[PDB]
Design an enzyme around this catalytic site. Structure first.
Site, mmCIF file in Angstrom:
data_model
loop_
_atom_site.group_PDB
_atom_site.id
_atom_site.type_symbol
_atom_site.label_atom_id
_atom_site.label_comp_id
_atom_site.label_asym_id
_atom_site.label_seq_id
_atom_site.Cartn_x
_atom_site.Cartn_y
_atom_site.Cartn_z
ATOM 1 N N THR D 1 0.731 -1.316 0.000
ATOM 2 C CA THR D 1 0.000 0.000 0.000
ATOM 3 C C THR D 1 0.756 1.361 0.000
ATOM 4 O O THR D 1 1.799 1.513 0.633
ATOM 5 C CB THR D 1 -0.977 -0.030 1.176
ATOM 6 O OG1 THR D 1 -1.776 -1.224 1.068
ATOM 7 C CG2 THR D 1 -1.944 1.151 1.152
ATOM 8 N N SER D 2 0.209 2.313 -0.762
ATOM 9 C CA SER D 2 0.469 3.747 -0.591
ATOM 10 C C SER D 2 -0.871 4.456 -0.378
ATOM 11 O O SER D 2 -1.745 4.398 -1.244
ATOM 12 C CB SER D 2 1.153 4.340 -1.826
ATOM 13 O OG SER D 2 2.307 3.611 -2.179
ATOM 14 N N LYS D 33 -9.279 0.732 -1.356
ATOM 15 C CA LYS D 33 -8.736 0.878 -0.003
ATOM 16 C C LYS D 33 -9.343 2.060 0.752
ATOM 17 O O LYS D 33 -9.038 2.271 1.928
ATOM 18 C CB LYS D 33 -7.220 1.045 -0.072
ATOM 19 C CG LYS D 33 -6.523 -0.106 -0.769
ATOM 20 C CD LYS D 33 -5.059 0.191 -1.012
ATOM 21 C CE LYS D 33 -4.418 -0.953 -1.773
ATOM 22 N NZ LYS D 33 -2.937 -0.886 -1.717
ATOM 23 N N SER D 129 3.520 1.092 2.823
ATOM 24 C CA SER D 129 4.909 0.843 2.425
ATOM 25 C C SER D 129 5.484 1.910 1.494
ATOM 26 O O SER D 129 6.649 2.284 1.625
ATOM 27 C CB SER D 129 5.019 -0.522 1.745
ATOM 28 O OG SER D 129 4.138 -0.607 0.638
ATOM 29 N N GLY D 130 4.666 2.396 0.563
ATOM 30 C CA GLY D 130 5.111 3.375 -0.426
ATOM 31 C C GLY D 130 5.243 4.801 0.081
ATOM 32 O O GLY D 130 5.830 5.647 -0.596
#
Ligand SMILES: [Cl-]
Ligand SMILES: [Cl-]
Ligand SMILES: [Mg+2]
Ligand SMILES: [Mg+2]
Ligand SMILES: [Mg+2]
Ligand SMILES: [Mg+2]
Lengths: 224, 222, 212, 196, 195, 125, 222, 204, 195, 196
Positions: D1-2, D33, D129-130
Site C-alpha cells: 500500500t500507498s 482501499k 509501504s510506499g
C-alpha cells in the site's frame, strides 16, 4: 552461499517458424524498491544469439563480461571467426551451463535464471534454459520467475507442441510475447512497463528492439 | 540459505527379456507445480549397447550421464576399442556415484543392455552407488506406484497356479518384447493418472543385439 | 537388515536376510548381503547399502594385493583390521556399517570379527548385526550349543533369520546360508521367506501367533 | 500500500492506490482501499487486508449504532473507535489506518493510526509501504488551505511517485473528496499519472 | 520400571515383571512389585514414567473394586481391559497424559479361559498368547514365536518364561534385578516365590 | 628442494655412485652370518686401532630390529643407524596392522626397498 | 485447484477443475469443487478440502434458516459477510479460499474470500494453485459486456489453462451459470478433455490365482 | 513420531457389478516391531462396512464411537443406516475434531438396500469425503495401492473376479511396505450375502 | 566400555576392567579385555568412545614398544604416563579428539615401587593410591576412602577390589558382565582367571 | 547515512551528511563521508565505516599505481576497481558506494555501486538509509545540465529532507564540487538547511 540483492524479474521467450523471440523488462529491483529503470537484461552475442538473464544483477554483469570475453577468445587465431567458426548459440549455452553447475557444486552459485535464444548455422531454432542450480531444459516456450506461471500458459496456446512451430509466424509470435508482457505488468509486483524485445530470424537476422512500452490496458471496478 | 538440490520429477522403468532389454521414461520435466518441458528426454544411448537414465535432480542426472558417456569414450582409448560390458559399466557407475558419497548425485540411476551371454540385463543404483542386477526396476517419482505392479506382472509375485491350494507358484518365464511394451505403456498411463509429476510423453529405448531402437507415445498433459 | 554368524564344533555358520529399505519403502527383496572375498573369507553387510558394498569389495581388492605381495592368503585378523582402520579414518563423516568378517586360516582356525563404522573391532564366537539383530539373538542364544551338527547349525542360522524377518519390519525377503570349514566356504542356497515360513510353521509347529 | 489523506479549504480528500499483494503476486490490481464508515467519515486502509476490513466493519457498526442514539458522530469520535480496536488488539493486528471526515463545525480533519494504536491528528497524513518514498516530496509541497484542484494535484503527484518506487503499490489512483457539497469519487489511470 | 512380560497358556496367564527401580546411576530398589490385583481373577502389570505408573494402576484398581462392591460381581477380563483402554485413550489427549504401558492377565470364569491383553499408553489394545512392553519384546517375541505352543501347561509356561529371562539377562544392557512371577488361573492369583 | 640426480648411468651401463657405495662396504669391518640346524649366529669384527674405548656405551655392531630379528652390517656406521631406525619403525607398524610380527624375509625386503629408493631418488646418495 | 468466476450481461458464471491431490498423489480424479450455499448462490472452493466443504455447508445451513426467518431469498452479501467473519475468527487456520457468486433481489454478484477473511470484488477472479495460469487467460481475453456464452467460454478456458499448466489442477471442468430471472444451472463435467485411453491389456486373473486360508459366511442380519 | 505411521496398516475398497469389496491387512506394530497379526481394520454396522487405517487407538475408538452412534440411529429411526448417510456421519464426526483430529484414514463400503447401488467412499483424517466410482485406498502403502488399483481395476467385475483383483491389489502393495502385511482379510459384499476370506500372504 | 578401576597396594598395582561391550540394546560381548601391555612392567586400561579406545591404546603400545627396542631399555611408569598425558593433551585441541580415559598401572624396577596413574581424555594426570573412571568412582572412591590402607598385601587388595565390584553390581544400573583383574608387580603382569 | 552525487553542466557535485552511528548513539557527528581516491575522482561512502574505508584505501592505492604507469585513470576505471572489490567480497562487505569524477573528455560522471557489487552509471545517484525518503523529491526535481548554483540547491534541499526524516542521518551537509576549475569543498550547517 549468497542472497540476491539487485534483481531482475521474468524473461520470456518462444520459437516461431523461422526463428526465436525473447523479451525482458528494463527493471533492477532492490527488494520492494523499484531502484533502477535503465537496465538491459537481454545481451546479444554476435548476430545469432541473445542471452536473457533474470535474478541477481551483479552476477548478470559478471556473465556479460564472460560472454564478452568469450567472443574475444574465439576470435584469437581464428580466420573463420566471422564465418564457419563463429560462436553458435549451442556453444554459448553449454559454456554457461557448465559454469552454472560448477558454481552450484562449489556452493557459491550465480543467482540467475538464464534463457539462451538464437539460430544455429544450419537454420535450426535454439532455445534453452539454465539456472543457479545448473538445471537445463528446452521447450517451444520458455520463461523464468512469474513468466513461468503466467506467460507460458499464454504462449503455449500459440505453440503447444513441436508441430505448431512451422504454423506460427513472427507477427503472431511477437503479438503473444507483447501480450504476455502486459499481463506480467498487471500481475507481477516487481515488473516495469518498459521492456526490450529481440527477434533472431534465420533470414532477417538479429532485430533488437529497445524502449518498448506496455499499452492498451483495462482498469474497471465492479459494484458492491 | 542456498539449497544446491532440486526435484525435477518424472519417473523411469527398466525391464529385461531373454534377448532384449527396455529402458523407458516419461518426457515431462517439472519444478514445484510448474512444467518446464513436455518433451525433455532423460533416457540416453551411451554407446556399446548401453542405455542409461539418472532420474531425480536433472542437473546431477545430466552430469552423471555426461561423465559415464565420457568414461565409455576413454575406456575405448585405453583398452584397444574393447566393448564395455554391462557388468563393467555398472561397476564403473558405482565409483562415479560413490566418488561423491559426501555430496551425492541426487538421482536414481538405471542402466539396461545385454550381458556377455546375450541375455537382457537391467542394473539399478541408489544415489551413492549401491547396485544390483534385476529383471525389473522402476525409479523416480512414481516408482512406488509402478514397482509393485511389476512385481506382480513381470515376476508373477503373489500369483499361484489355480486349483493347487496355493501350493504351486505361477512359473517364471521370459516375456516377449510385445508383452513388455504393453506393461510399460500401462504402467506409465496408470502412473500419469495418479501422479502429478508424471505425464506429457513416454519414450522407450529398446536394446537388442542389432542396436538401440526408440518408440514414443503420447501421455495425458494435465 | 538381520545378519548373523556363529562359531561351532564344525566351523562357522553365516546367515543373512536380503531386504533393502528406504524408510518404510521396501526397495529390494533380493539384495546380496554376503560378499565372497576369497574361497576362505566372507563379509556380511548391514547399515548403508553403498557404504557396505563399496568398501567390502574394496576390502577384497586389498586382500588380493596382500597375497600377491606376501605369497600367502591374508589372515582374518589382518583383513578385518584393514576394514576397521579404513572406517576409523572416516569416523564422524557419517559412514554406516555393521559388518562381520568370517573365515578360516591355518594359524587362526575358524574366526569371526565384528567391525562397525564407529571403529569397533571385536573377535567373538557369536554376533548378530542389524535392525533385527535382537530377534535373531533371541532364537540363536536359546538354541545354541557348541556341539551342534552341521545340519542342525545350518537350520538354527536359517531359523534365526526367519524369526527376525518375521518380527522386524525392516528385515525379510529371503535367507542366504553359508558354511565355512577348513576347506573354505560352502553356499547353502537362497531360501525365500514366502515359502520358508509356512514350511517351518507346519513342520516345526511354531509361529502359533500367526493365523494358520 | 500507498495511502494518504489531505485537508484543504473546503474539506478533506483521501487518496490510495489499488494493489493487493500476496508476496510478489498482485492478488487484486483494482482494490478499493478507501472505505466508508459513515456518510462523511471515511478511512484509508493499509497493512493486512483481512484485519483492516474486520476493523472497518466493526467501526461502521459502532457509528451506525451511535447515530441511531446520539446523531452524527464527530470525526474525532470515529478515530477513537478505530484506536480502541487497534490499541487493545495490537498483538493480533497489522493495520495502519488513516481516518478522514468532514464536519460543518470542524471542517476537514485527518487522524492517522499507526501499528501501535496511537492517534495523531495532522493537517495531512501519509501511510503504507510506499509512503516512505514521498516523505521528502510531501513535506516540501504541502500547503495549508489549498484549493480542491491543488489538493487533487498534490495527492496525484505524491501517490504517482510512491507507486513509481514501491513495488507493493500500483494500479489506479483512487480518491474520495469530502466537502459540504457531498461525496465525490475520483479515479486516475496509469497512462495519466505515470508521465507526470 | 522397564521389563514386563506375559504368557497365556492352556489354563492360566503368567506375568513376569522386573524388580529393579533405578533413578540416575543408582538402583534404589531390587524387590519392587510392578503389579496390582484389580479383582480376584484379574491382574495388571505396568511400566513407564515414574509416578504415573503406580498412580494409574491404583486408580484403575480403585474403580474395579468400586464396581465389584456395587454390583456384587466380578467384571470379565475383557470388560476390565476395555475400561482400562478407554481410560488411556482419554488420557493421551489430556493436558498431561499418563505415560504408562500395561499388561492385563485374567481368567474368565464364565468362559473358563485365560486371557492376556497388551495395552500401551496411547490406548492400543490387543489380545495375545504372549506379550511384552518396551525393549523386552525385541528379544522375547521371536523367542516365543519359536518355543510357544497353545496347549502348554503352567509348568511348561514357567520354563518358557525362564528361557525369556535368561535371554534378557544375557543381552539386555541394564541390570533389572530379576523378575516377580505371578500366575492367574481358575483359583485366582498366586505368586511364585522361588524364581 | 635439492633435486640433483646423483645416481646415474654411465656409458658402460654402470651406476658409479652405487658401485662406489660398495667400496665403502668393502672398507667396513668384517661381518659374518652362519645359520645352523636350529639357530643363526652373527659374528662381527671390531678393529683394534681403537684402545681406550668404552664398550658399555659404544654402539654394538648387531642391532635388534624386533625381539625375534637382528641386523648387522658393514660400511658407514652413520648410514646404518638410519636403516635400523626405519626397520624398527616398520617392525612396530607391521605388528599394529597385521597383528603379527614381521617375517625375516619381509623385514629384509623392506630394508632393501629403502636402499633401492636411494639409488633413483633426486638429491640423495 | 484452479477456480474462476466471471460476470456477464445478466448474471455470473463460476467454474472449477476436478483434481484433488495429497502431496504429489491424485486422491480424487473427479471431485466437486462447486458448492451450493442456496439455490441461486454457489461457491467455488480451493485450499483445505474438508474446510471448504464444511464452511460452505455451515453458512449454507444458516443462510437457509435466515431465508425462512426473513421470508426472503438469500443475498450473496449475507453469505459473504457470514463466511468472512467465520474465517477471520479462525485467523486463517480454516484454510478455505472461496469464490462466492450468485443472483438475488439486489442483482448479480461476484466475490472472493481468502482464508484470513479478506474479501475482494471483481468482474473476473481466480483462486487456487492454478490461479496464475487462469488469471493470465482472464487478463488476456476478458472484456466489458460479455454475453452468457462468451463468459462460459472464458471461464472454462481459464480453468483449462490451470488443468494443462498447473500440476495441482487436472481432469475435468465443472461450471455453474447463475442468470438473473432464471434457475441456476449446474453443469457437472461440462468439459471432459482428459479421458483415460484404452489399456493395452486386461489384468483379469484366472479364478483361483489368489491363495486362500479360510472362508466363512458373515452375518449381517439381526 | 508421525501418528499415521506408528502402527501401520492398509485398507482398500472396490466396486463391481452389483457388489462391493473391502479388504485390509492384519498387522499392528510399534514402528519396526511387529506386535499383532490378528488386528482387523474392517468393521460393520448393519450392512454398512467401515475400514479404518492409521493410529490403532483411534481405529478402536472410532469403531466404538460409530457403533454407539449407529445403534442410537437405529433405535430412533427404526431402520438400519445406509452407506450414503453413514458417510455423512463419519465426515461430521471427524470435522468435529478439526483442530485435534483422530489420526485415521477411514473407508466406507456397502450397498444401499433401497436402490441396490454399490457405494464406496474415503476420508482424510479430518472429514473430507472422497467419493469414487471405482476404488478407494488408505494406509501406509496408499501410494502402492493407488498404483495397483489404477492398473489392475476394470469396471463391472463379477464378485468372484472382483475378489481376485482387490486381493492382488492389496497383497502386492503390502509387500512393498514395511509396515503393512502380516495377513489379510477380504470382504465380498452382495445385496444379501457377505463372504469373508483370509488370504495367504508372505509373513515378513 | 564403562568400568575401569585401579588399586595401588604395598608391592603391586591391581587393575579391574569390565568385560561388557554394549551397543544399543544388545550386549555384543561379555569377555572383552579392556587393557594393553605397554611394557613388561606397565599396563594400561582404557574406557570411552567406541573405536577411539582401542585405536589409542594400540597406538601408545606401538610407541612404547618402539622405544624399548631402540634403547634396549624399559621406560619408567612415570615416563610412560607423561608420554600418554602429552598425547592426550595434544589430542584435545585436534580436529577430532581422542575421547579415551585411561589408568596406567606400573611397577618401577629402579624404585621397587608400584605406581598408579589416572589420566582422562583432556590429559589430566594424577598419581593415586586408588583410581576409577566414569560413574564407577561415585561408588568406589568413598568405599576405598574407608577400607583402603597403604600397607596392604596383593591378597588384601583383591579382597578390597571384590568389595568394590560387589557394590557396583548392587547399585549400578547397567550389567557390565563382571571384570578382568590383572596384577602388576616386580615379576611383571599376570591375570587372575577366577574372579 | 544519506549520500548523493549529481552531474551538471560544468561537472559533478558529491553530497553527504556527517553522521556515524553505533545503534542510536552518534559516534561521530562531524564525519567526512566524501573521500578522495584521485585528484578529481571522489566517492560517497555508505554502509560499514570500516569496510568503506578499507575499500577506499585500496582503491586509492590502485589508482596511484595506475597513474604511475598509465597516467590519469578514467572515472569508469575507478568505478571498475570499486566494483571488483565489492563484487568479489560481497559475502564479507557492507558497502554502498557512489563514485563520481571529472574528465575533460567525458565531463561529469556518476557510478553507483549497491550491496551486491553491481555497477550503474546514472545522471545522478542517491544512497544510504536516508535516500529512501527522497526518491520522490529527487525524481521530481532533478534536471540535466543544471548550473552549479542550481545543483548545490538541489543537493542541499534533498539531503535536508533525508536528514529530517532519517534518524541515522544528520549533522552538517558536506559537498565536493568537481569541475575543470578544480576541487571546491562546501559545508552547510543545521541553522541554514533545517529551515529550508
Ligand atoms: Cl481490501
Ligand atoms: Cl568513517
Ligand atoms: Mg499426470
Ligand atoms: Mg518383517
Ligand atoms: Mg509499483
Ligand atoms: Mg510387508
Amino acid at each position: 552461499t549468497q542472497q540476491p540483492i539487485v534483481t531482475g524479474t521474468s524473461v520470456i521467450s518462444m520459437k516461431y517458424d523461422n526463428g526465436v523471440i525473447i523479451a525482458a523488462d528494463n527493471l533492477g529491483s532492490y527488494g520492494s524498491l523499484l531502484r533502477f529503470n535503465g537496465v538491459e537484461r537481454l545481451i546479444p552475442v554476435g548476430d545469432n544469439t541473445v542471452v536473457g538473464i533474470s535474478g541477481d544483477i551483479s552476477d548478470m554483469q559478471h556473465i556479460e563480461r564472460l560472454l564478452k570475453d568469450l567472443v574475444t577468445e574465439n576470435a584469437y587465431d581464428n580466420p573463420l571467426a566471422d564465418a564457419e567458426e563463429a560462436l553458435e548459440p549451442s556453444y554459448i549455452f553449454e559454456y554457461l551451463a557448465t559454469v552454472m553447475y560448477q558454481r552450484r557444486s562449489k556452493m557459491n552459485p550465480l543467482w540467475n535464471a538464464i534463457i539462451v535464444a538464437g539460430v544455429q548455422s544450419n537454420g535450426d531454432q535454439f532455445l534453452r534454459y539454465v539456472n543457479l542450480l545448473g538445471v537445463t531444459y528446452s521447450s517451444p516456450t520458455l520463461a523464468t520467475g512469474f513468466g513461468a506461471h503466467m506467460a507460458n500458459p499464454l504462449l503455449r496456446k500459440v505453440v503447444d507442441r513441436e508441430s505448431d512451430i512451422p504454423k506460427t509466424t513472427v507477427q503472431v509470435a511477437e503479438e503473444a510475447i507483447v501480450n504476455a508482457m502486459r499481463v506480467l505488468y498487471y500481475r507481477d509486483a516487481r515488473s516495469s512497463r518498459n521492456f526490450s524485445l529481440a527477434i533472431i530470424d534465420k533470414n532477417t537476422g538479429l532485430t533488437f528492439k529497445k524502449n518498448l512500452q506496455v499499452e492498451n490496458m483495462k482498469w474497471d471496478f465492479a459494484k458492491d | 540459505q542456498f539449497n544446491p538440490y532440486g526435484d525435477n520429477g518424472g519417473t523411469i522403468l527398466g525391464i529385461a527379456g531373454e534377448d532384449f532389454a527396455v529402458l523407458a521414461g516419461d518426457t515431462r520435466n517439472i519444478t514445484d507445480y510448474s512444467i518446464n518441458s513436455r518433451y525433455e528426454p532423460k533416457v540416453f544411448d551411451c554407446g556399446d549397447n548401453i542405455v542409461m537414465s539418472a532420474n531425480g535432480f536433472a542437473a546431477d542426472g545430466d552430469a552423471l550421464v555426461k561423465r559415464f558417456k565420457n568414461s565409455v569414450k576413454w575406456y575405448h582409448f585405453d583398452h584397444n576399442d574393447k566393448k564395455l560390458s554391462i557388468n563393467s559399466a555398472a561397476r564403473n557407475i558405482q565409483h562415479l556415484l560413490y566418488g561423491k558419497r559426501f555430496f551425492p548425485y541426487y538421482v536414481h540411476t538405471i542402466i539396461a543392455g545385454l550381458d556377455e551371454d546375450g541375455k537382457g540385463a537391467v542394473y539399478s543404483f541408489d544415489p551413492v552407488g549401491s547396485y544390483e542386477r534385476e529383471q525389473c526396476r522402476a525409479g523416480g517419482a512414481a516408482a512406488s506406484l509402478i514397482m509393485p505392479f511389476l512385481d506382480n506382472q513381470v515376476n508373477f509375485k503373489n500369483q499361484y497356479e489355480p486349483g493347487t491350494n496355493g501350493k504351486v507358484k505361477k512359473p517364471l518365464k521370459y516375456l516377449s518384447v510385445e508383452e513388455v511394451i504393453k506393461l510399460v505403456r500401462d504402467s506409465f498411463t496408470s502412473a500419469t493418472e495418479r501422479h502429478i509429476q508424471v505425464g506429457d510423453g513416454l519414450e522407450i529405448l529398446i536394446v537388442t543385439k542389432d542396436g538401440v531402437r526408440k518408440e514414443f507415445y503420447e501421455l495425458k498433459r494435465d | 537388515t538381520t545378519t548373523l554368524a556363529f562359531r561351532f564344533q564344525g566351523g562357522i555358520i553365516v546367515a543373512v536376510d536380503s531386504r533393502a529399505t528406504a524408510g518404510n519403502w521396501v526397495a529390494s527383496q533380493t539384495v546380496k548381503k554376503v560378499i565372497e572375498i576369497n574361497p576362505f573369507l566372507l563379509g556380511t553387510m548391514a547399515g548403508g547399502a553403498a557404504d557396505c558394498q563399496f568398501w567390502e569389495t574394496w576390502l577384497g581388492s586389498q586382500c588380493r594385493l596382500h597375497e600377491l605381495r606376501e605369497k600367502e592368503r591374508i589372515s582374518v585378523a589382518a583383513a578385518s583390521k584393514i576394514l576397521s582402520n579404513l572406517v576409523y579414518q572416516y569416523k564422524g563423516a557419517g559412514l554406516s556399517m555393521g559388518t562381520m568378517i568370517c573365515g578360516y586360516t591355518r594359524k587362526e582356525g575358524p574366526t569371526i570379527y565384528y567391525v562397525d563404522s564407529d571403529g569397533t573391532r571385536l573377535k567373538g564366537d557369536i554376533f548378530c548385526v542389524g535392525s533385527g539383530q535382537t530377534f535373531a539373538y533371541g532364537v540363536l542364544d536359546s538354541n545354541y550349543k557348541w556341539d551342534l551338527s552341521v545340519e542342525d547349525a545350518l537350520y538354527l542360522g536359517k531359523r534365526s533369520i526367519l524369526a527376525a524377518a518375521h518380527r522386524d519390519a525392516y528385515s525379510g525377503g529371503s535367507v542366504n546360508l553359508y558354511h565355512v570349514t577348513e576347506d573354505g566356504w560352502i553356499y547353502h542356497g537362497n531360501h525365500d521367506v514366502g515359502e520358508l515360513f509356512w514350511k517351518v510353521k507346519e513342520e516345526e509347529g511354531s509361529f502359533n501367533n500367526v493365523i494358520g | 500500500t500507498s495511502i494518504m489523506a489531505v485537508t484543504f479549504k473546503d474539506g478533506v480528500i483521501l487518496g490510495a492506490d489499488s494493489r493487493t499483494t500476496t508476496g510478489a503476486y498482485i492478488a487484486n490490481r483494482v482494490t478499493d482501499k478507501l472505505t466508508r464508515v459513515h456518510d462523511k467519515i471515511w478511512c484509508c486502509r493499509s497493512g493486512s487486508a483481512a484485519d483492516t476490513q474486520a476493523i472497518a466493519d466493526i467501526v461502521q457498526y459502532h457509528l451506525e449504532l451511535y447515530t441511531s442514539q446520539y446523531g452524527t458522530p464527530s470525526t474525532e469520535t470515529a478515530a477513537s473507535v478505530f484506536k480502541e480496536l487497534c490499541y487493545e488488539n495490537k498483538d493480533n493486528l497489522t493495520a495502519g489506518i488513516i481516518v478522514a471526515g468532514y464536519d460543518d463545525k470542524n471542517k476537514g480533519e485527518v487522524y492517522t493510526i499507526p501499528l501501535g494504536g496511537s492517534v495523531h491528528k495532522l493537517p495531512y497524513a501519509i501511510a503504507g509501504s510506499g509512503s516512505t518514498f514521498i516523505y521528502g516530496y510531501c513535506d516540501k509541497n504541502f500547503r495549508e488551505n489549498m484549493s480542491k484542484e491543488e489538493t487533487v494535484d498534490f495527492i496525484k503527484h505524491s501517490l504517482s511517485q510512491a507507486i513509481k518506487w514501491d513495488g507493493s503499490s500500483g494500479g489506479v489512483i483512487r480518491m474520495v473528496v469530502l466537502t459540504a457539497a457531498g461525496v465525490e469519487r475520483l479515479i486516475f489511470y496509469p497512462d495519466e499519472y505515470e508521465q507526470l | 520400571m522397564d521389563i514386563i512380560l506375559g504368557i497365556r497358556v492352556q489354563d492360566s496367564v503368567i506375568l513376569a515383571s522386573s524388580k529393579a527401580v533405578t533413578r540416575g546411576i543408582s538402583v534404589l530398589k531390587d524387590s519392587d512389585d510392578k503389579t496390582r490385583q484389580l479383582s480376584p481373577h484379574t491382574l495388571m502389570s505396568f511400566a513407564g514414567e515414574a509416578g504415573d505408573t503406580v498412580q494409574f494402576a491404583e486408580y484403575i484398581q480403585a474403580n474395579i473394586q468400586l464396581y465389584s462392591i456395587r454390583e456384587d460381581y466380578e467384571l470379565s477380563p475383557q470388560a476390565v481391559s476395555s475400561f482400562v483402554r478407554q481410560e488411556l485413550a482419554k488420557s493421551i489427549r489430556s493436558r498431561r497424559p499418563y505415560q504408562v504401558n500395561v499388561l492385563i492377565g485374567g481368567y474368565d470364569k464364565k468362559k473358563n479361559k485365560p486371557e492376556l491383553y497388551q495395552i500401551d499408553y496411547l490406548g492400543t489394545k490387543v489380545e495375545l498368547p504372549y506379550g511384552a512392553h518396551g525393549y523386552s519384546g525385541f528379544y522375547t517375541f521371536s523367542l516365543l514365536d519359536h518355543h510357544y505352543r497353545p496347549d502348554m501347561t503352567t509348568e511348561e509356561g514357567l520354563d518358557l518364561l525362564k528361557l525369556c529371562v535368561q535371554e534378557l539377562e544375557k543381552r539386555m544392557p541394564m541390570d533389572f534385578k530379576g523378575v516377580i512371577v505371578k500366575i492367574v488361573d481358575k483359583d485366582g492369583i498366586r505368586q511364585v516365590d522361588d524364581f | 628442494g635439492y633435486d640433483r640426480a646423483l645416481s646415474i648411468f654411465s656409458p658402460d651401463g654402470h651406476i658409479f655412485q652405487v658401485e662406489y657405495a660398495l667400496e665403502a662396504v668393502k672398507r667396513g669391518t668384517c661381518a659374518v652370518g652362519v645359520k645352523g640346524k636350529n639357530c643363526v649366529v652373527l659374528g662381527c669384527e671390531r678393529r683394534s686401532t681403537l684402545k681406550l674405548q668404552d664398550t658399555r656405551i659404544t654402539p654394538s655392531k648387531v642391532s635388534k630390529i624386533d625381539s625375534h630379528v637382528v641386523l648387522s652390517f658393514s660400511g658407514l656406521n652413520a648410514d646404518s643407524r638410519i636403516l635400523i631406525e626405519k626397520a624398527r619403525v616398520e617392525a612396530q607398524s607391521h605388528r599394529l596392522t597385521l597383528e603379527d610380527p614381521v617375517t625375516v624375509e619381509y623385514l629384509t625386503r623392506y630394508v632393501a626397498g629403502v636402499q633401492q629408493r636411494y639409488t633413483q631418488s633426486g638429491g640423495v646418495r | 485447484t484452479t477456480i474462476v468466476g466471471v460476470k456477464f450481461n445478466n448474471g455470473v458464471v463460476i467454474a472449477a477443475d476436478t483434481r484433488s491431490t495429497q502431496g504429489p498423489i491424485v486422491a480424487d480424479k473427479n471431485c466437486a469443487k462447486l458448492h451450493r450455499i442456496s439455490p441461486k448462490i454457489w461457491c467455488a472452493g480451493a485450499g483445505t478440502a474438508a474446510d471448504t466443504e464444511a464452511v460452505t455447508q455451515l453458512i449454507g445451513s444458516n443462510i437457509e434458516l435466515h431465508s425462512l426467518y426473513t421470508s426472503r431469498e438469500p443475498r450473496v452479501v449475507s453469505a459473504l459477510q457470514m463466511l468472512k467473519q467465520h474465517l477471520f475468527k479462525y485467523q486463517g487456520h480454516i484454510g478455505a479460499y472461496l469464490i462466492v457468486a450468485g443472483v438475488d433481489p439486489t442483482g448479480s454478484h461476484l466475490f472472493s474470500i481468502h482464508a484470513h477473511g479478506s474479501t475482494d470484488v471483481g468482474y473476473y477472479l481466480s483462486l487456487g494453485s492454478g490461479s496464475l495460469a487462469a488469471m493470465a487467460v482472464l487478463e488476456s481475453h476478458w472484456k466489458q459486456d460479455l454475453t452468457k456464452e462468451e463468459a462460459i467460454k472464458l471461464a472454462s478456458d481459464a480453468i483449462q489453462a490451470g488443468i494443462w499448466n498447473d500440476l495441482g489442477s487436472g481432469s475435468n471442468v465443472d461450471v455453474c451459470v447463475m442468470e438473473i430471472g432464471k434457475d441456476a444451472e449446474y453443469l457437472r463435467n461440462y468439459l471432459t478433455p482428459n479421458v483415460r485411453e484404452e489399456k493395452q491389456k486386461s489384468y483379469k486373473f484366472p479364478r483361483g490365482t489368489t491363495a486362500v486360508l479360510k472362508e466363512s459366511i458373515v452375518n449381517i442380519c439381526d | 513420531s508421525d501418528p499415521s505411521s506408528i502402527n501401520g496398516g492398509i485398507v482398500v475398497a472396490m466396486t463391481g457389478k452389483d457388489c462391493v469389496a473391502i479388504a485390509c491387512d492384519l498387522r499392528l506394530g510399534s514402528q519396526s516391531l511387529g506386535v499383532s497379526n490378528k488386528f482387523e481394520k474392517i468393521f460393520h454396522y448393519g450392512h454398512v462396512f467401515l475400514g479404518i487405517t492409521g493410529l490403532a487407538t483411534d481405529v478402536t475408538t472410532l469403531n466404538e464411537m460409530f457403533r454407539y452412534k449407529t445403534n442410537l440411529y437405529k433405535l430412533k429411526e427404526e431402520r438400519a443406516i445406509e452407506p450414503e448417510t453413514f458417510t455423512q456421519l463419519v465426515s461430521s464426526s471427524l470435522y468435529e475434531r478439526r483442530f485435534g483430529p483422530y489420526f485415521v484414514g477411514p473407508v466406507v463400503a456397502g450397498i444401499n438396500s433401497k436402490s441396490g447401488k454399490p457405494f464406496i467412499a474415503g476420508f482424510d483424517l479430518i472429514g473430507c469425503i472422497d467419493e469414487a466410482k471405482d476404488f478407494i485406498v488408505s494406509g501406509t502403502a496408499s501410494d502402492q495401492l493407488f498404483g495397483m488399483c489404477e492398473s489392475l481395476y476394470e469396471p463391472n467385475l463379477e464378485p468372484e473376479d472382483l475378489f481376485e483383483t482387490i486381493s492382488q491389489a492389496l497383497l502386492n502393495a503390502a509387500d512393498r511396505d514395511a509396515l503393512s502385511g502380516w495377513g489379510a482379510v477380504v470382504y465380498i459384499i452382495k445385496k444379501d450375502e457377505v463372504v469373508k476370506r483370509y488370504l495367504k500372504m508372505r509373513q515378513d
